[PDB]
Write an enzyme that holds these catalytic residues in place. Structure first.
Site, PDB file in Angstrom:
ATOM      1  N   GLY A  43     -74.607  37.144 -44.719  1.00 13.15           N
ATOM      2  CA  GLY A  43     -75.670  37.824 -44.172  1.00 13.15           C
ATOM      3  C   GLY A  43     -77.105  37.050 -43.870  1.00 13.15           C
ATOM      4  O   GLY A  43     -76.719  35.994 -43.854  1.00 13.15           O
TER       5      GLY A  43
ATOM      6  N   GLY B 237     -77.551  44.979 -47.201  1.00 15.96           N
ATOM      7  CA  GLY B 237     -76.041  45.544 -47.483  1.00 15.96           C
ATOM      8  C   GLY B 237     -75.012  44.654 -47.363  1.00 15.96           C
ATOM      9  O   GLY B 237     -73.807  44.989 -48.079  1.00 15.96           O
ATOM     10  N   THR B 238     -75.119  43.594 -46.561  1.00 11.90           N
ATOM     11  CA  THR B 238     -74.045  42.478 -46.324  1.00 11.90           C
ATOM     12  C   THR B 238     -74.123  41.510 -47.592  1.00 11.90           C
ATOM     13  O   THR B 238     -72.944  41.409 -48.253  1.00 11.90           O
ATOM     14  CB  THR B 238     -74.031  41.974 -45.205  1.00 11.90           C
ATOM     15  OG1 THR B 238     -74.133  43.016 -43.900  1.00 11.90           O
ATOM     16  CG2 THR B 238     -73.011  40.970 -44.767  1.00 11.90           C
TER      17      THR B 238
ATOM     18  N   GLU C   6     -70.598  19.015 -65.185  1.00  6.62           N
ATOM     19  CA  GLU C   6     -71.025  18.562 -66.480  1.00  6.62           C
ATOM     20  C   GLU C   6     -72.334  19.241 -67.096  1.00  6.62           C
ATOM     21  O   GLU C   6     -72.547  19.710 -68.360  1.00  6.62           O
ATOM     22  CB  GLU C   6     -71.039  16.946 -66.440  1.00  6.62           C
ATOM     23  CG  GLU C   6     -71.391  16.345 -68.027  1.00  6.62           C
ATOM     24  CD  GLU C   6     -71.353  14.840 -67.883  1.00  6.62           C
ATOM     25  OE1 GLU C   6     -70.184  14.254 -67.294  1.00  6.62           O
ATOM     26  OE2 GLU C   6     -72.485  14.267 -68.384  1.00  6.62           O
TER      27      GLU C   6
HETATM   28  N1  LIG Z   1     -85.468  33.790 -48.604  1.00  6.44           N
HETATM   29  C1  LIG Z   1     -85.035  34.403 -47.712  1.00  6.44           C
HETATM   30  N2  LIG Z   1     -84.940  35.713 -47.878  1.00  6.44           N
HETATM   31  C2  LIG Z   1     -84.457  36.278 -46.842  1.00  6.44           C
HETATM   32  C3  LIG Z   1     -84.092  35.886 -45.841  1.00  6.44           C
HETATM   33  N3  LIG Z   1     -83.705  36.912 -44.676  1.00  6.44           N
HETATM   34  C4  LIG Z   1     -83.706  37.944 -45.460  1.00  6.44           C
HETATM   35  N4  LIG Z   1     -83.994  37.775 -46.835  1.00  6.44           N
HETATM   36  C5  LIG Z   1     -84.136  38.847 -47.841  1.00  6.44           C
HETATM   37  O1  LIG Z   1     -82.865  39.469 -48.087  1.00  6.44           O
HETATM   38  C6  LIG Z   1     -83.009  40.644 -48.296  1.00  6.44           C
HETATM   39  C7  LIG Z   1     -82.681  41.448 -47.084  1.00  6.44           C
HETATM   40  O2  LIG Z   1     -81.311  41.162 -46.926  1.00  6.44           O
HETATM   41  P1  LIG Z   1     -80.700  40.453 -45.522  1.00  6.44           P
HETATM   42  O3  LIG Z   1     -79.902  39.131 -45.922  1.00  6.44           O
HETATM   43  O4  LIG Z   1     -81.465  40.372 -44.569  1.00  6.44           O
HETATM   44  O5  LIG Z   1     -79.478  41.429 -45.171  1.00  6.44           O
HETATM   45  P2  LIG Z   1     -77.987  41.467 -44.705  1.00  6.44           P
HETATM   46  O6  LIG Z   1     -77.196  40.570 -45.855  1.00  6.44           O
HETATM   47  O7  LIG Z   1     -78.120  40.752 -43.411  1.00  6.44           O
HETATM   48  O8  LIG Z   1     -77.456  43.099 -44.643  1.00  6.44           O
HETATM   49  P3  LIG Z   1     -77.626  44.080 -43.494  1.00  6.44           P
HETATM   50  O9  LIG Z   1     -78.589  43.719 -42.683  1.00  6.44           O
HETATM   51  O10 LIG Z   1     -78.125  45.350 -44.457  1.00  6.44           O
HETATM   52  O11 LIG Z   1     -76.161  44.249 -42.949  1.00  6.44           O
HETATM   53  C8  LIG Z   1     -84.606  40.867 -48.457  1.00  6.44           C
HETATM   54  O12 LIG Z   1     -84.898  40.974 -49.885  1.00  6.44           O
HETATM   55  C9  LIG Z   1     -85.205  39.784 -47.635  1.00  6.44           C
HETATM   56  O13 LIG Z   1     -86.520  39.393 -48.071  1.00  6.44           O
HETATM   57  C10 LIG Z   1     -84.399  34.306 -45.432  1.00  6.44           C
HETATM   58  O14 LIG Z   1     -84.145  33.931 -44.226  1.00  6.44           O
HETATM   59  N5  LIG Z   1     -84.734  33.915 -46.511  1.00  6.44           N
HETATM   60 MG   LIG Z   2     -67.889  10.725 -69.658  1.00  8.04          MG
END
Ligand SMILES: Nc1nc2c(ncn2[C@@H]2O[C@H](COP(=O)(O)OP(=O)(O)OP(=O)(O)O)[C@@H](O)[C@H]2O)c(=O)[nH]1
Ligand SMILES: [Mg+2]
Ligand SMILES: Nc1nc2c(ncn2[C@@H]2O[C@H](COP(=O)(O)OP(=O)(O)O)[C@@H](O)[C@H]2O)c(=O)[nH]1
Ligand SMILES: [Ca+2]
Ligand SMILES: [Ca+2]
Ligand SMILES: [Mg+2]
EC number: 3.6.5.-
Lengths: 440, 50, 421
Positions: free
Chosen positions: A10, A144-145, A254
């Site tokens: 994701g 979601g992913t 370790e």
């Molecule tokens: N540190 C950090 N957090 C991120 C980043 N992109 C998204 N987030 C966080 O991840 C969460 C959202 O999930 P995403 O990873 O964007 O969603 P996805 O896994 O792509 O899921 P869907 O889009 O619903 O299919 C939130 O808490 C965002 O603040 C990134 O590049 N860095």
């Molecule tokens: Mg050792």
């Protein structure tokens, strides 16, 4: 031999993977085309950097990595970006439709359509390993992913690789950069379904990183790019023991022996120093004692919680750069006489130390000063349960009214899965209280 | 009296090799238990997911 | 009685094992290619105890190198005397044992052990008259501890009339790699109590304290610890390796040193302590001093069942006899009165970069302090079942830990019984 396979799931998992792999290339002298002039063994070898990089006959060093997202737009930026030649196209996997911030879509409705292909591509990486150690899985709790597809993948990896190690880097949600009201539902569902399938999980609170960027790097309004550069430094500290050799180097496995007293109690608190601007680093050299002292300041932690109000079960210090054991041991002796470090009565109090001599690297256009020495502390503290308590409370507020639950039920989930996940979190909160009680 | 001594030495030796035989039996049971628990974990994860 | 077969298992076992062969190769005038370039017939007279003779008057250590990971044995092969070992005597897997006794003893180690026994059998078969085996290992890790004690059990099954001797490095929180060391050490001690004839207790607690307090090393490394171990190991094997009357083979040492079969855990000592000229009175006082003991036990907290003292260098045998009698006569209460004449003394003319040295081997009831210390660290974790999942994951039950703890507490009681008698 001792290969590690990285899986980035994701948006958060993929953008953090981009930052980590860029940094690993700079640490090992690997160019964006995959060439590594310093590597004299063409097309293979068993150097320490071969844990994370395979080699083609044409001298290309290829990340042992799969990138998966259910929509294409984030992975399309890797496909056309600076490091596009680093990855074979089959390592970069995209669907057409994302999970719309819904665990049920990531685990079931959309996820089921791509899981067999992802396991196929992972199998291709595993088949090129002579001694696969295990997997490193990067994802958000909130998406979601990141939540639902990761849960599905972790379950399927337990089936296809049995007890091979699975380590997570998990992005814990903060309101300053969150994109969904239902993140607490997604966080509890994925924590419940993943907990039996994961050996060790490093939580990264977006709010802790956000605050470190604001307070220590003077960034007015941190972007994902700012957060991800800092996260990549912490990830790099943790994986440095797998990627480099040295006499004083201590393998991550370790440290894991010391960090996981019981299978469920597998959430180490990471603290990283020094995080300093170029303007503040200029003519201010931070010693071993200063960076070690900074590991016991809550403001430098990757998760917001107060270890001064819980108990230690383990304390590990992973040093990189210009660090010798004499200076470490004097730093620790000073800290023991001055700080609130209370161990549980069933655990020895010794700090476990590793030193990797290769200094930290920074990415051009970054916010972090290039320093001569850095440290990552991994501690097993009861205080990390505060992070669960915050998420559980938000879950309870919404779930008491069944707010948004129809989006999950519409995708085939039952209320029973919500109450079962929440009960597992209650039992986890309780496990963290129990391990902190004194022996009779 | 020399044969009687030799028979007591052979007896103490057969007793030792029986005890070492129970140890090899136990070693065989530990590794089979390890396999059976890994297989049961994989099996039960496979069924719960289905 | 002639050939000894040496086995070195795991990181510790192979690091101290390599130093042992460097040190005794230098004493016997053997160079890194296995050629003899010494100046005395005393060097070659009992060379066959530890060395095989090959084509072109080459001397090859009767040594088998064992590990579940290649790293430490690659470093041995590159180390100064690395080319002297027989290449077919390197037996290694790829998995490692993750500092886990159960992996060494039951899962990873079980996979490798048969190929180690193939090499032991090859070495044993060409022996004119095998005396037995010495193993170097630690008790705190997984390979040395778990696979080492598996090997001992299998060697006993195939050679039940031969002597088994260990150099066993006991773990300390002061020089620690993991929290599970006390588990690995308790499970190993249970094996050693049943399946060795003689165990040299090399305490990392004592080696650290000697390096820090006595030798004024602010930051002791494994190299500093191993300098003490290799000097002790050279000292305690002098009588096996050089012409002499006393304890000249493993069975005679055992008969002099072990009054009850389970009480075979020895406290070694060395003088002088080294990182210019020592008198016989000074050697004798220093070799019996708590501060020169390689096990962190106060000998004034127990009684000596038996002692072997070995003096090395050109010195007065009359003055050695007088001083050794002086220590016993002045400190008579610390030597059990129901084993008469329980202190034996050997003198060898060849010194180790010193003019004279003394090595001490004691069977003291004070060794119980070492087992009690491990027992306390075991219980502190075991009462909460902390870190057990690492072991149950490899097929072990809690009951096996309860049995190991009881047997080690029984060993402590038995030392206490003879201390009060
Ligand atoms: N540190 C950090 N957090 C991120 C980043 N992109 C998204 N987030 C966080 O991840 C969460 C959202 O999930 P995403 O990873 O964007 O969603 P996805 O896994 O792509 O899921 P869907 O889009 O619903 O299919 C939130 O808490 C965002 O603040 C990134 O590049 N860095
Ligand atoms: Mg050792
Ligand atoms: N004295 C000494 N102790 C060591 C050395 N290497 C490791 N240790 C100790 O040995 C124990 C760890 O076991 P080790 O031999 O590394 O594990 P193995 O390879 O699984 O047998 C710990 O008690 C360490 O303190 C060494 O070279 N010398
Ligand atoms: Ca190469
Ligand atoms: Ca195998
Ligand atoms: Mg997305």
């Amino acid at each position: 031999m001792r290969e590690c396979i990285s899986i980035h799931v994701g948006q958060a998992g993929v953008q953090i993977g981009n930052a980590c792999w860029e940094l690993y290339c700079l640490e090992h002298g690997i160019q964006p085309d995959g060439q590594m002039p310093s590597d004299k063994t063409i097309g293979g070898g068993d150097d320490s950097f071969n844990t994370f990089f395979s080699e083609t006959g044409a001298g290309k060093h290829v990340p042992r990595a799969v990138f998966v997202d259910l929509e294409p737009t984030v992975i399309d930026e890797v496909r056309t970006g600076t490091y596009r030649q680093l990855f074979h196209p089959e390592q970069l996997i995209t669907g057409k439709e994302d999970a719309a911030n819904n665990y049920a879509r990531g685990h079931y409705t959309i996820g089921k359509e791509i899981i067999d292909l992802v396991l196929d591509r992972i199998r291709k990486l595993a088949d090129q390993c002579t001694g696969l150690q295990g997997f490193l899985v990067f994802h958000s709790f909130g998406g979601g992913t990141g939540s639902g597809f990761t849960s599905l993948l972790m379950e399927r990896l337990s089936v296809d690789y049995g007890k091979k190690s699975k380590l997570e880097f998990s992005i814990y949600p903060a309101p300053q950069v969150s994109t969904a009201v239902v993140e607490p539902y997604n966080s509890i569902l994925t924590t419940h379904t993943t907990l039996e399938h994961s050996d060790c999980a490093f939580m990264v609170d977006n709010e802790a990183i956000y605050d470190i960027c604001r307070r220590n790097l003077d960034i007015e309004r941190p972007t994902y790019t700012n957060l991800n550069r800092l996260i990549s430094q912490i990830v790099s500290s943790i994986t440095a023991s797998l990627r480099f050799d040295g006499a004083l180097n201590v393998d991550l496995t370790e440290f894991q022996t010391n960090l996981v007293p019981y299978p469920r109690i597998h959430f180490p608190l990471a603290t990283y120093a020094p995080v300093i601007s170029a303007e503040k680093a200029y003519h201010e050299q931070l010693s071993v004692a200063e960076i070690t002292n900074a590991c016991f300041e809550p403001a430098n932690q990757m998760v917001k919680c107060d270890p001064r109000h819980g108990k230690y079960m383990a304390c590990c210090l992973l040093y990189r750069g210009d660090v010798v054991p004499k200076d470490v041991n004097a730093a620790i002796a000073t800290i023991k006489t001055k700080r609130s470090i209370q161990f549980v009565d069933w655990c020895p109090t010794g700090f476990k130390v590793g030193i990797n001599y290769q200094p930290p690297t920074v990415v051009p256009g970054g916010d972090l000063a290039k320093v001569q020495r850095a440290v990552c502390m991994l501690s097993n503290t009861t205080a990390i349960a505060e992070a669960w308590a915050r998420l559980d409370h938000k879950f309870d507020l919404m779930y008491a009214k069944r707010a948004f639950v129809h989006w999950y039920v519409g995708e085939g989930m039952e209320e029973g899965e919500f109450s079962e996940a929440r009960e597992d979190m209650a039992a986890l909160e309780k496990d963290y209280e129990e391990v902190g009680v004194d022996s009779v | 009296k020399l044969e009687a001594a030799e028979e007591r030495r052979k007896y103490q030796e057969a007793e030792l090799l029986k005890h070492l035989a129970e140890k090899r039996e136990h070693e065989r049971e530990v590794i089979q238990k390890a396999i059976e628990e890994n297989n049961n974990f994989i099996k039960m994860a496979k069924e719960k997911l289905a | 009685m002639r050939e000894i077969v040496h086995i070195q298992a795991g990181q510790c076992g192979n690091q101290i094992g390599a130093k042992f062969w460097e040190v005794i190769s230098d004493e016997h005038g053997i160079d890194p290619t296995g050629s003899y370039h010494g100046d005395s017939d005393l060097q070659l007279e009992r060379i066959n105890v530890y060395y095989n003779e090959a084509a072109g008057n080459k001397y090859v250590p009767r040594a088998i190198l064992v590990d579940l990971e290649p790293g430490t044995m690659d470093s041995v092969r590159s180390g100064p005397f690395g080319q002297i070992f027989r290449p077919d005597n390197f037996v290694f897997g790829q998995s490692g044992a993750g500092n886990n006794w159960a992996k060494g003893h039951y899962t990873e180690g079980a996979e490798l052990v048969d190929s180690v026994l193939d090499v032991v059998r090859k070495e044993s078969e060409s022996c004119d008259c095998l005396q037995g085996f010495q193993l170097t290992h630690s008790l705190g890790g997984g390979t040395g501890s778990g696979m080492g004690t598996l090997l001992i059990s299998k060697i006993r099954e195939e050679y039940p009339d031969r002597i088994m001797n260990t150099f066993s490095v006991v773990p300390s929180p002061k020089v620690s790699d993991t929290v599970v060391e006390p588990y690995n050490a308790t499970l190993s001690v249970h094996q050693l109590v049943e399946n060795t004839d003689e165990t040299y207790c090399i305490d990392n607690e004592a080696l650290y304290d000697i390096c820090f307090r006595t030798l004024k090393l602010t930051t002791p490394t494994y190299g500093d610890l191993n300098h003490l171990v290799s000097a002790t190991m050279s000292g305690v094997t002098t009588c096996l390796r050089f012409p002499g009357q006393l304890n000249a083979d493993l069975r005679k040492l055992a008969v002099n040193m072990v009054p009850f079969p389970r009480l075979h855990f020895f406290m070694p000592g060395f003088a002088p302590l080294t990182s210019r000229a020592l008198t016989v009175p000074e050697l004798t006082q220093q070799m019996f001093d708590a501060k020169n003991m390689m096990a962190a036990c106060d000998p004034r907290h127990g009684r000596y069942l038996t002692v072997a003292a070995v003096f090395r260098g050109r010195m007065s045998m009359k003055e050695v006899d007088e001083q050794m009698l002086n220590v016993q006569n002045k400190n008579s209460s610390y030597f059990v009165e129901w084993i008469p004449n329980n202190v034996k003394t050997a003198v060898c003319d060849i010194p180790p970069g010193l003019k004279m040295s003394a090595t001490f081997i004691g069977n003291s009831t004070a060794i119980q302090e070492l087992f009690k210390r491990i027992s306390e660290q075991f219980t502190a974790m075991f009462r909460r079942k902390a870190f057990l999942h690492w072991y149950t994951g490899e097929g072990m039950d809690e009951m096996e830990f309860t049995e190991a703890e009881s047997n080690m507490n029984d060993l402590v009681s038995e030392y206490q019984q003879y201390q009060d008698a």
